[PDB]
Design a protein around this ligand. Structure first.
Ligand SMILES: *[C@@H]1O[C@H](CO)[C@@H](O[C@@H]2O[C@H](CO)[C@@H](O)[C@H](O)[C@H]2NC(C)=O)[C@H](O)[C@H]1NC(C)=O
Ligand SMILES: *[C@@H]1O[C@H](CO)[C@@H](O[C@@H]2O[C@H](CO)[C@@H](O)[C@H](O)[C@H]2NC(C)=O)[C@H](O)[C@H]1NC(C)=O
Ligand SMILES: *[C@@H]1O[C@H](CO)[C@@H](O[C@@H]2O[C@H](CO)[C@@H](O)[C@H](O)[C@H]2NC(C)=O)[C@H](O)[C@H]1NC(C)=O
Ligand SMILES: *[C@@H]1O[C@H](CO)[C@@H](O)[C@H](O)[C@H]1NC(C)=O
Ligand SMILES: *[C@@H]1O[C@H](CO)[C@@H](O)[C@H](O)[C@H]1NC(C)=O
Ligand SMILES: *[C@@H]1O[C@H](CO)[C@@H](O)[C@H](O)[C@H]1NC(C)=O
Ligand SMILES: *[C@@H]1O[C@H](CO)[C@@H](O)[C@H](O)[C@H]1NC(C)=O
Ligand SMILES: *[C@@H]1O[C@H](CO)[C@@H](O)[C@H](O)[C@H]1NC(C)=O
Ligand SMILES: *[C@@H]1O[C@H](CO)[C@@H](O)[C@H](O)[C@H]1NC(C)=O
Lengths: 164, 48, 323, 216
């Protein structure tokens, strides 16, 4: 939680390569928010940055299945917290799986969690679909010999509760 | 971090799927007051 | 957006006052989440209508039609068709500034590399399997014998294609080429996407700049009001900040709701085209774009989708006496 | 019969409806709770501000009540308008499906659901409608050698509807969406061009209905 020559702010002070003009004081950003500063006692260009922030997210199978949950810390690096680092943030309490299955509980950036294997919440790169490669050749055609008749329910709102 | 989800859901049975519950703000370890290098009051010029 | 933080930065003093407005803070998250959820529902409805991921055969013989333009590029690390790269360059700090105050950008559920697998599948089945993959198990059919149907769809008897195939090949390929430069040489074609991205980043800037406005309070720094003034009075001041800021969220939130409802409408238009135009053949005049429609090729673009409509436009006329 | 088993145990398939009913009562609830909030005023009970203070002060406080509540309406109202349009577009889609799917047969693909569409049966549901789409989905496939054309005398023969196939010897023309092979005669095929141009034409003999009819 820093104060520089009366400038106050709270951030992560780092070394930085951005180069001031000599007379200048604050670097800034598109938002006018303080970005870079110059250490007065020895002139050096320090960045600034937000704290980890993000939202907490509780990934759970239904409380009917388990009382176990895997916490996702969103958009952070895993320090400030069985841990795993994701694209979407710091995930805790779900064992990574190199296998890839259907997306079940959507998390972020393709990471999708499911409960099954004893058992533990897992996290894995969602397989979009099962894979197929059509067997294709310029004389090859496949004509269905038989059919099914399927009845697929489709459901739509029409009106909503009227009020005054 | 699990029980907070039940409060957010407002149901003793939290059905499957992900729930945003709370937020964490990393608190800062200590304060930096960095006034520039070097005044001084002339007590060497008054007292000596 | 984090309502308690965005309004009251790092101050319990302000944070306690916010409790006296009740559920505003929470109902905003309930609002934005409704948006944020269905966004990944939109992208879900549009791109993945197909049960399986098809992939093109190893060797390309389509009868002269050259799809190396539109098919996934095997040599890119993220496999995306040559065209799609033209798009991702056109469309485009705001990286952490917003993320200072509790304005967060959540990752879209589907990574771009996944979007490019769908639009590979949809495009892989369209080429090999005709339109049948939308109605069930894909059926391999010779592509040149696919286009005999898609002419029967528009009323041109198939004997035209079996005779004009070579010609139609070149017209197709030379048409695909110009699609590159149409995108390559002009940056305004993507304005629709570019406008969406801007307006989002627009309001965020505006939403941020609202933090620096006095709103009648003595200063825009929430701590200065606490530093200078004894609380008794500073309470009334912080109201004008809160009332101002808290309102300023509802403005932003309401905009997003309205704006999302537009996208929600545009998404269905895509999902309609994707289903009817790409997966089937459309009989709806000028729904797939001017001319009699043959087939469509989906292509992903950032927070959007781009269709290449292959259409049949007649040319040369001869006056005939008729009866 | 499968439909009724699904509904028997499925709470989720109605999620679209159940959500709509929820979200209203939700904002309706929240609208009510806003009557308990101070909004900065000394209490959320209207009269209890009055009988505590002499009214010339209450005129000030009741602002922060009204300014609060009046806002909370305009929040709730502006919600409903937005949410109304959301239903509005959904209602338009229902009219479109009711019109095209049930009263017609929709040539549109996957508008009435996966597979080619036969008919739909609407069913009412609270604040909504439920269609039962009866769709025709093919099933069992058989790899076939095919040709886009067939030479006979040097004329080319193309199918009127369907495609020339063979299981590897006898060339059959069949309808596309079902396998129903038929011997190839002029009534199946029309003549266009000749044997040079087509790419993939094969050598075969298109039987003639008429020729045998003569021979007596
Ligand atoms: C499809 O078109 C691409 C380019 O549009 C062709 O790739 C070119 O192939 C020639 C070989 O004669 C090379 O000299 C070029 O450098 C290639 N260009 C690129 C961009 O790769 C490809 O050969 C064509 N294939 C078919 C089947 O038509
Ligand atoms: C392809 O189908 C044709 C049509 O049935 C077959 O031809 C018949 O084959 C049966 C074999 O049990 C014979 O009894 C008939 O006399 C054949 N009729 C004609 C007109 O040829 C043919 O054998 C099939 N071939 C393959 C490889 O499946
Ligand atoms: C179908 O039959 C025609 C003849 O009616 C074939 O055309 C000739 O095929 C021979 C080889 O068997 C070549 O040496 C000749 O040069 C071909 N014709 C000419 C004028 O060049 C044809 O190859 C057969 N196969 C097809 C076309 O399906
Ligand atoms: C849910 O839990 C109840 C008990 O609370 C049980 O009777 C029911 O079978 C469970 N259902 C599922 C789908 O787990
Ligand atoms: C996390 O920090 C490590 C080093 O501390 C760094 O290598 C890594 O890239 C960081 N990841 C993120 C997402 O910040
Ligand atoms: C996946 O495999 C890699 C080796 O390729 C290994 O390092 C990693 O630990 C594996 N992941 C899990 C979750 O076991
Ligand atoms: C048919 O006749 C009209 C007469 O004005 C003319 O404008 C038109 O060009 C003619 N068509 C062709 C193909 O020349
Ligand atoms: C058609 O051939 C492909 C070749 O890989 C095969 O996988 C497929 O099973 C065949 N069709 C049937 C109905 O067996
Ligand atoms: C079909 O492709 C094969 C390559 O496997 C080739 O030998 C044959 O000539 C092609 N036929 C046509 C009609 O394109």
């Amino acid at each position: 939680n820093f104060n520089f020559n009366g400038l106050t702010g709270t951030g992560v002070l780092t070394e930085s390569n951005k180069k001031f003009l000599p007379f200048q004081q604050f670097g800034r950003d598109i938002a006018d928010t303080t970005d870079a500063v110059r250490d007065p006692q020895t002139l050096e260009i320090l960045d600034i940055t937000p704290c980890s922030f993000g939202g907490v997210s509780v990934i759970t199978p239904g409380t009917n299945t388990s009382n176990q949950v895997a916490v996702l810390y969103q958009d952070v690096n895993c320090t400030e917290v069985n841990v795993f680092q994701t694209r979407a943030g710091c995930l805790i309490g779900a064992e990574h799986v190199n296998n890839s299955y259907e997306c079940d509980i959507p998390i972020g950036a393709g990471i999708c969690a499911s409960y099954q294997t004893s058992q533990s919440i897992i996290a894995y790169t969602m397989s979009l679909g099962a894979e197929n490669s059509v067997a294709y050749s310029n004389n090859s055609i496949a004509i269905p010999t038989n059919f099914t008749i399927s009845v697929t329910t489709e459901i739509l709102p029409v009106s909503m509760t009227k009020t005054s | 971090p699990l029980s907070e989800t039940k409060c957010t859901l407002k149901s003793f049975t939290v059905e499957k799927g992900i729930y945003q519950t709370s937020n964490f703000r990393v608190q800062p370890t200590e304060s930096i007051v960095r006034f520039p290098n070097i005044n001084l009051c002339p007590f060497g010029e008054v007292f000596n | 957006v984090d309502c308690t933080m965005y309004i009251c930065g790092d101050s319990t003093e302000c944070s306690n006052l916010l409790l006296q407005y009740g559920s505003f803070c929470t109902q905003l998250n309930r609002a934005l989440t409704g948006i944020a959820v269905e966004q990944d529902k939109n992208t879900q409805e549009v791109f993945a209508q197909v049960k399986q991921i098809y992939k093109t055969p190893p060797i390309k013989d389509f009868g002269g039609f050259n799809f190396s333009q539109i098919l996934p590029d095997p040599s890119k690390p993220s496999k995306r068709s040559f065209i799609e790269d033209l798009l991702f360059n056109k469309v485009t700090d705001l990286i952490c500034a917003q993320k200072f105050n509790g304005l967060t950008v959540l990752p879209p559920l589907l990574t771009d590399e996944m979007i490019a697998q769908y639009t590979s599948a949809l495009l892989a089945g369209t080429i090999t399997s005709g339109w049948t993959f939308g109605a069930g198990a894909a059926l391999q059919i010779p592509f040149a014998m696919q286009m005999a149907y898609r002419f029967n769809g528009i009323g041109v008897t198939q004997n035209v294609l079996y005779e004009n195939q070579k010609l139609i090949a070149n017209q197709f390929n030379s048409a695909i080429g110009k699609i590159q430069d149409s995108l390559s040489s002009t940056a305004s074609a993507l304005g629709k996407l570019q406008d969406v991205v801007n307006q989002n980043a627009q309001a965020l800037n505006t939403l941020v700049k609202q933090l620096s406005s006095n709103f009648g309070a003595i200063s825009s720094v929430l701590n200065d009001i606490l530093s200078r003034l004894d609380k008794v009075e500073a309470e009334v001041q912080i109201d004008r900040l809160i009332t101002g800021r808290l309102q300023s969220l509802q403005t932003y939130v309401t905009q997003q709701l309205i704006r999302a409802a537009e996208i929600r409408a545009s998404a269905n238009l895509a999902a309609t085209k994707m289903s009817e135009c790409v997966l089937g053949q459309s009989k709806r005049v000028d729904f797939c774009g001017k001319g009699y429609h043959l087939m469509s090729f989906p292509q992903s673009a950032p927070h959007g989708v781009v269709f290449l409509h292959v259409t049949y436009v007649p040319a040369q006329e001869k006056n005939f006496t008729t009866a | 019969g499968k439909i009724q088993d699904s509904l028997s145990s499925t709470a989720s398939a109605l999620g679209k409806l159940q959500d709509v009913v929820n979200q209203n009562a939700q904002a309706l609830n929240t609208l009510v709770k806003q009557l308990s909030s101070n909004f900065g005023a000394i209490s959320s009970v209207l009269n209890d501000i009055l009988s505590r203070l002499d009214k010339v002060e209450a005129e000030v406080q009741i602002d922060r009540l009204i300014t609060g509540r009046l806002q909370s309406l305009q929040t709730y109202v502006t919600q409903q308008l937005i949410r109304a349009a959301e239903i509005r577009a959904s209602a338009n889609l229902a009219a479109t499906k009711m019109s095209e799917c049930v009263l017609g047969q929709s040539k549109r693909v996957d508008f009435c659901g996966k597979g080619y569409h036969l008919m739909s049966f609407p069913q009412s549901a609270p604040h909504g409608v439920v269609f039962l789409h009866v769709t025709y989905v093919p099933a069992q496939e058989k790899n076939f050698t095919t040709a886009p054309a067939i030479c006979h005398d040097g004329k080319a023969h193309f199918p009127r509807e369907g495609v020339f196939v063979s299981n590897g010897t006898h060339w059959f023309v069949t309808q596309r969406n079902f396998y129903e092979p038929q011997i190839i005669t002029t009534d199946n095929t029309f003549v266009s061009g000749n044997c040079d141009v087509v790419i993939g034409i094969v050598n075969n003999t298109v039987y003639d209905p008429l020729q045998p009819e003569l021979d007596s």
